[PDB]
Amino acid sequence: EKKPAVSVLTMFRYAGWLDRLYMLVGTLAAIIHGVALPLMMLIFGDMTDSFASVGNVSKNSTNMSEADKRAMFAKLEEEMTTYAYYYTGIGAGVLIVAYIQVSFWCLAAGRQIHKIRQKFFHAIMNQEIGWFDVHDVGELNTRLTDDVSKINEGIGDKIGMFFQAMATFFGGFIIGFTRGWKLTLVILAISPVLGLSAGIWAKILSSFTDKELHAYAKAGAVAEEVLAAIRTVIAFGGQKKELERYNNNLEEAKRLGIKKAITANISMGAAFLLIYASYALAFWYGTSLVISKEYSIGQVLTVFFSVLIGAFSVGQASPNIEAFANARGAAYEVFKIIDNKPSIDSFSKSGHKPDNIQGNLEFKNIHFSYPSRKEVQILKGLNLKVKSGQTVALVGNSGCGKSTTVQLMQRLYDPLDGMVSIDGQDIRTINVRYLREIIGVVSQEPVLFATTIAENIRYGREDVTMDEIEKAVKEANAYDFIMKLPHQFDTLVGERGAQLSGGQKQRIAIARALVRNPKILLLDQATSALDTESEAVVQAALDKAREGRTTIVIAHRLSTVRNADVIAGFDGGVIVEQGNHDELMREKGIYFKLVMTQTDVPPASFWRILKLNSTEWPYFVVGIFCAIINGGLQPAFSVIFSKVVGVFTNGGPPETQRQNSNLFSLLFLILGIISFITFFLQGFTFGKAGEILTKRLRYMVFKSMLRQDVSWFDDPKNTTGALTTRLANDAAQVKGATGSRLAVIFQNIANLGTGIIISLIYGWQLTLLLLAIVPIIAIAGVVEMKMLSGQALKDKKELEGSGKIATEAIENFRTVVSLTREQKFETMYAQSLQIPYRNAMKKAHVFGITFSFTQAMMYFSYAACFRFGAYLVTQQLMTFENVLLVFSAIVFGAMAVGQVSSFAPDYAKATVSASHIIRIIEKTPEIDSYSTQGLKPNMLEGNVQFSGVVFNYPTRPSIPVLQGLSLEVKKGQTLALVGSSGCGKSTVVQLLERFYDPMAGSVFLDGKEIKQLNVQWLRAQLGIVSQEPILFDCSIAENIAYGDNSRVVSYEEIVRAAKEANIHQFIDSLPDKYNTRVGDKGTQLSGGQKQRIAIARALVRQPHILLLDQATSALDTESEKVVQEALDKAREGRTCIVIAHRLSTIQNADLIVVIQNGKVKEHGTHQQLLAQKGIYFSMVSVQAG
């Protein structure tokens, strides 16, 4: 894959001359700060020479008593005044420089973003409507705030840190070469061995990464299928069969998880070894160059560090490039849109603006193809005139052609041939905005914007008085309902506010269009989406709106049409018949045939989580052990480094300097080996311990999830997706809080513990300073991580309003362009953006300081140590060796916990990720579907009885559905439930299923409380048939046999059921018979066919009760009669409850219940409820008239 990017020099367009200056001045700061630490190493070298030169004089030979004490020691006291003044000089310059660096870079980036957001949005509001047709709008809106957020990374402070790291790369390799070149070319011969070893593992870790996501993708697919189809899963008791499918694919990603877990800790210790190796090689060789009196001890300690800093400076500039290249890439998809210019420019000011429009309309030889499907011609040779003040209705067979006419007169596409003219004038020769200002449009579905009614109306024309609104709302027939709304004209509508009916929204849409006082009216099914009641007021308001306006109406009710002055009949893009109603009727053509048919804050305990991995404590014991050793190797190195430098700085004979130096030099590879061993074993024991824990926890969750009752899966929070996430990554992210947390804390304790102890005895005065100040500098790195994050919320929350505005505008682009308010939303966007602008321009001032005062308290405090430590050698109270054994035992050890803590997984993100897992496991349901107790008799009667049932849904607890609902179905009878639309009718089926218990009342089965019968054996004798039958991606054999689980389904037993479902004959005429894969992968089945399969699945069980809920909810007319045949077969001598919405099934039923407000208003046979002349009578009358 090769994703494009922008040329670097392009991408900084929109950068003003002041931004070109800030980036320059800020860079010069970054270069200075870069070389500023190499100087700290040069002095640190020349400081040990000053100590080494005298450290062995006052000891070895006792020449003078106090004329040697004061001589050498009053020399150091004057030498160290300068080295301390030198150190403090850096921190002063750092404090200034570091501020200018991040100040000026974040500033110049911010100034550029605010100029990008506005230009990018405007670019989107300037596109064509065929431009929106081809593109996916969803990713476009996220591209407004994600891609613009991907650029601000790679132009902000991330550059200032890069030129810093490069200024150290060259600043560091400079000092090494000019102070001694043998040592460096030794090291730079090894750094290719390490630059190679580093990149290799990232190629091998990425290998075992993508292979893992394809391992769980099998398991996580079974997960998604179940939890969408859970209603079918519980109703057929396959809660364990689905646990095994999810499990038998769950071992793949475990074994693969180990090849990542081992090879990750190999990669750690492998490169952790090559540091300890190249340390000895550079010190073994470095000691041999001071023995021959070429270098001093101060020379080596400069050069070895000033290389490794500059050499490690690359790895710190790796991501700052990658973030800059991510910014180039995201900036391409955006800058393309800004530089794209349309043919139909909704912003240009080109064409005429003719006054006194008659509105003669002429279509001439129009040919047209849409641009998403340019292979299909829509119109061929289409011709037609509208005379001033006339109404034109367009009729004809189903097609997009009629609306295409309406879309071309808006000029939202440019026809392929022919010409659309107004008063003799080509519509492509006037201006676009003037055109649409004279044109109103009432679309099929009305868009209301989330504002007040006044503002929704004012979108039509922003200079309007409340008087003028009042006239229009009247004309649209919306005034009386508005006066009855709670805040009248200020009531808030849209997606956020009070819901208006369909009829009321359209009259508002009509009022919006009326304010425009256009000369032409276009209506595209303004009455389709409305029942005959709501429609009458709307037709009256439409009919009002047409007076003296030129009108083309896409009509759905025929009676509305007969008031038109002329009818055009369309067939295949071509006007076949044209005339008044009687002419086309007389023609007995197309038109005639038509008109005579229509007549989350859980704090889990650290110990609770640890117990989850307790089954594998032997893995844990070892990992603790190696976590102590590896935590002890750091204070070892602080000695073996000190004991080396001690030789050359405290006193010794040059007869022992060989064996002491070379010994300690090879104790590094002792330490280096022990590093590699304790890591390969730490991540082999704590590694499997985690990859076990995931697999065992993903199972225990998914098991515990199917145990839950239906009220849980009804919740808004436990949607089928948020459960797959919780089951997939949150289940795995736990292991960063069981073993990996012990490995940290045992290392961290074993590191700072044993290093505090040692430094205290070798000299306690220096330590109480350092362990008092390490608290200070350690704090500072946290508050930066906090306020970098706590500030991330503020600026990025204030952007949601700015982003929500744009969301409202893109999601209804076809609407707003017809209102020509592309500019209004642009202004609304910019004004909202002025807050995160002014906040960000103070932000860089802050992070300028938090970055400045971090480095100043470190460079200053570097003097307060090597000053205090120096006075301890002046006063003959401590040696220079013991200082280095204190300094590099606290500092390099306090630096160790950070290098540990930043590697290990985010502990906070893992605990809360785990606390949710325990809750999803420890939850026990109201309805233990898994249970084993319950009566389960041999009594196959099947008398059903509801007594005074009272029930509310706990998802929607305030609503009543059933109050005192009582009703019996006697053995073998069919009962039909009828009544007004409501969940009361449907609820009876879910309570007999027992997906929920009732709050009060009782459901009995043969005289027995269902709360006392096994949940599995209640549901085992119930065959459910839902509206939309859910089929599993699987063979026909599996989908039908799924109904009777734990059962020996034979070829014989399946086929008799398919006979009685009436599908047998259909199976035998198609390929591969009963083995056919069904779903999206396989032959796609129709709507009608699927339901017939659901009946067959229920038939195999041969249950005593059949539950039919709103079945036949489809339009396949022939299929419908097939279903009813199978159903009459399926009903035979079985106890049946049918939720009937279509009336004809009910006539042959043995008993009918009419339900209203939880209460059984009436009942009887078909004939008896009719002759009562009550509620049932009212419903049935609607069908025949």
b/e map of 27-64 (b: 16 or more CB within 10 Å)?
bebbbbbbbbbbbbbbbbbbbbbbbbbbbbebeeeeee
SS3 for 912-962 is HHHHHHHHHHHCCCCCCCCCCCCCCCCCCCCCEEEEEEEECCCCCCCCCCE
List of long-range contacts for 656-662, beta carbons under 8 Å, 24+ apart: 657/287, 657/291, 658/291, 661/283, 661/284, 661/287, 661/291, 662/284, 662/287
Residues belonging to the chain: 1185
The residues near 9 (Cβ < 8 Å, ≥ 6 apart) are none
Q: Judge whether 400 and 390 are in contact, CB under 8 Å.
A: no
Question: Euclidean distance between the first and final Cα of the chain, in Å?
Answer: 64
Distance of alpha carbon 97 from alpha carbon 85, whole angstroms: 18
Q: How was this structure determined?
A: X-ray
Half-sphere exposure of 410 (CA within 13 A, CB side): 24
Q: Judge whether 220 and 724 are in contact, CB under 8 Å.
A: yes
1158: left (phi over 0), alpha (psi -120 to 50) or beta: left
3-state secondary structure of 1110: coil
Distance of alpha carbon 682 from alpha carbon 903, whole angstroms: 14
CA-to-CA dists, residue 575 to 72, 254, 361, 587, 1147, angstroms: 113, 67, 16, 14, 47
Please name the amino acid found at residue 95: L
Residue 572: is it exposed, middle or buried by C-beta count within 10 angstroms (0-12/13-18/19+)?
middle
Please name the amino acid found at residue 652: G
CA-to-CA dists, residue 110 to 100, 801, 850, 851, angstroms: 15, 18, 18, 18
* Maximum pairwise Cα distance, the chain: 137
For the beta sheet containing 520-524, the strands, ordered from the edge strand earlier in sequence to the opposite edge, are 439-442, 520-524, 550-554, 391-396, 566-571, 574-579
Architecture of domain 933-1185: 3-Layer(aba) Sandwich (3.40)
Please name the amino acid found at residue 333: E
Closest C-alpha to 55, from 650, 656, 877: 650
Q: 351-599 has which fold?
A: Rossmann fold (3.40.50)
Tally Cβ neighbours within 10 Å of residue 648. Answer: 25
Distance of alpha carbon 784 from alpha carbon 880, whole angstroms: 35
Distance of alpha carbon 187 from alpha carbon 177, whole angstroms: 11
Domains 1-350+600-932 and 351-599 share a fold: no
DSSP per-residue letters across 583-626:
HHHHHTSHHHHHHTT--------HHHHHGGGGGGHHHHHHHHHH
Element spanning 553, H or E: strand 550-554
Closest C-alpha to 328, from 113, 712, 688, 7: 7
Binding-site residues from annotation for ATP: 396-403, 979-986
Q: 989 phi and psi, to 5 degrees?
A: -65, -40
Four-residue CA torsion sign, 279, 282, 284, 287: negative
Output the six-digit token pair for 459: 């979108």
Q: Are strands 566-571 and 574-579 parallel, antiparallel or unpaired?
A: antiparallel
Give the torsion through C-alpha atoms of 841, 846, 851, 855, to 10 deg.
Answer: 140
Four-residue CA torsion sign, 1130, 1135, 1137, 1142: positive
Residue with tokens 């209804």: 812
Give the torsion through C-alpha atoms of 1106, 1110, 1114, 1116, to 10 deg.
Answer: 40
Closest C-alpha to 1180, from 1166, 1163, 1161: 1166
Give the torsion through C-alpha atoms of 1007, 1008, 1010, 1012, to 10 deg.
Answer: 170
What is the crossing angle of helices 720-728 and 191-228, to 10°?
140
Distance of alpha carbon 732 from alpha carbon 694, whole angstroms: 5
Binding-site residues from annotation: 396-403, 979-986
Output the six-digit token pair for 1028: 């939309």
Distance of alpha carbon 777 from alpha carbon 856, whole angstroms: 10
Q: List the beta bridge partners of residue 379.
A: 368
- Domain parsing of the chain, residue ranges: 1-350+600-932, 351-599, 933-1185
Q: Are strands 550-554 and 944-951 parallel, antiparallel or unpaired?
A: unpaired
Give the torsion through C-alpha atoms of 234, 240, 243, 247, to 10 deg.
Answer: -170
Please name the amino acid found at residue 208: F
Distance of alpha carbon 976 from alpha carbon 695, whole angstroms: 48
DSSP per-residue letters across 283-321:
HHHHHHHHHTTSS-HHHHHHHHHHHHHHHHHHHHHHHHH
Output the six-digit token pair for 288: 């041999």
Ordered alpha helix ranges (H), 799-933: 799-810, 813-819, 822-874, 880-901, 907-922
Output the six-digit token pair for 178: 């000019």
Distance of alpha carbon 856 from alpha carbon 389, whole angstroms: 81
Q: Judge whether 328 and 6 are in contact, CB under 8 Å.
A: yes
Distance of alpha carbon 168 from alpha carbon 174, whole angstroms: 9
Output the six-digit token pair for 1049: 């389904």
Distance of alpha carbon 414 from alpha carbon 435, whole angstroms: 14
DSSP per-residue letters across 406-427:
HHHHTTSS--SEEEEEETTEEG
Please, what CATH class does the domain formed by 1-350+600-932 belong to?
mainly alpha
Output the six-digit token pair for 247: 């499990």
Q: 1154 phi and psi, to 5 degrees?
A: -95, 115
CA-to-CA dists, residue 907 to 148, 546, 786, angstroms: 30, 68, 15
3-state secondary structure of 377: coil
Element spanning 782, H or E: helix 764-797
Distance of alpha carbon 229 from alpha carbon 222, whole angstroms: 11
Four-residue CA torsion sign, 1004, 1005, 1008, 1010: negative
Residue 641: is it exposed, middle or buried by C-beta count within 10 angstroms (0-12/13-18/19+)?
buried
Q: Are strands 974-979 and 1135-1139 parallel, antiparallel or unpaired?
A: parallel
